[PDB]
Amino acid sequence: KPAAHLIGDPSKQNSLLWRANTDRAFLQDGFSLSNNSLLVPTSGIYFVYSQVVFSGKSSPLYLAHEVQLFSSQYPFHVPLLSSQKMVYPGLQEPWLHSMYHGAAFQLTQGDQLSTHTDGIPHLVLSPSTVFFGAFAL
């Protein structure tokens, strides 16, 4: 059974570039990355999940993080999983927001799972706090 669990590269801090080549991250039975996307190995149902954590501290700060499926038609990107938060100005204490979700999706071979994030500078890059994963049912 195909499975993959991805992790952020902490060496970037201004990008969320996924990897699978450490302790705690992996590709298995056919998964593969193509330009920061995860590539569905065969058609079938897949549980897909992803977690992020932001922290910190004029205008409102928009946080967001989405698991996407690349498509050929307009949009080019349909959202499978979505979360937003919005941290505001006058906060006398440091903040910390955490987004987790996962669901089952029928996918086909060669489909592309990517993630888009807003508030990347605020991400908490560690193996247990920011991840992207998928496995075949």
Partner: protein
């Protein structure tokens, strides 16, 4: 990208030998590595995927090992039909870079070549050019030297060689040398010779004709 550095570029082993080939990757790559086998003028065959798993219908002498960064194809008992370039490939990222290949040759006992010479066809002399052909047949090893004497005067830049691939049974080679020259210069001379040097011949064999 990622780079797949295979080594050695080429090796030579006898039948029944254990052969071992390495592939070092530019990154860590999980276990996402595949191995292919390519005989000349044929599409590659899949041998191993996922570093160690053997694709179906690949015989058990082919094995794959390795993790993270240093990977290894192993043929336990080399068969006379296993001569090929073997490619490793990273299956982790895109594009899925292949390595540069490893030419596995089979090592054999020495075998002197059988020499044959061919004059130019009458129908080709109508064309105004004369091809002379020398065949070296079923020899080993590949290293052979063919000299073209025309009236004992050796030739320089007017021949071309081509060699077949190892036979899948006797593991030998064959060479074709083609001395090409004008009909004019062909009829100025009488004796066309072909002098073969090879390890299997204690003393060079010449083969020739008169016109």
């Amino acid at each position: 990208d990622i780079q797949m550095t295979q080594s050695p570029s080429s090796l030579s082993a006898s039948v029944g030998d254990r052969v071992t080939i390495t592939c070092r990757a530019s990154q860590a790559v999980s276990s996402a590595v595949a191995w292919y086998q390519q005989k000349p003028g044929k599409a590659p065959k899949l041998l191993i995927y996922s570093a160690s798993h053997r694709y179906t219908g690949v015989p058990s002498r082919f094995s794959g090992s390795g993790s993270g960064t240093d990977f290894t194809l192993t043929i336990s008992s080399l068969q006379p039909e296993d001569f090929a370039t073997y490619y490793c490939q990273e299956s982790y990222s895109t594009p899925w870079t292949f390595g540069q290949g490893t030419k596995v040759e089979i090592k054999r006992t020495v075998a002197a070549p059988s020499v044959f010479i061919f004059p130019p066809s009458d129908e080709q002399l109508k064309s105004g050019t004369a091809s002379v052909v020398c065949l070296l047949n079923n020899f080993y090893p590949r290293e052979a030297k063919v000299q073209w004497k025309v009236d004992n005067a050796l030739q320089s830049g007017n021949s071309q060689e081509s060699v077949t691939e190892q036979d899948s049974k006797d593991s030998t080679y064959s060479l074709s040398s083609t001395l090409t020259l004008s009909k004019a210069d062909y009829e100025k001379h009488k004796v066309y010779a072909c002098e073969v040097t090879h390890q299997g011949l204690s003393s060079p064999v010449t083969k020739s004709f008169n016109r």
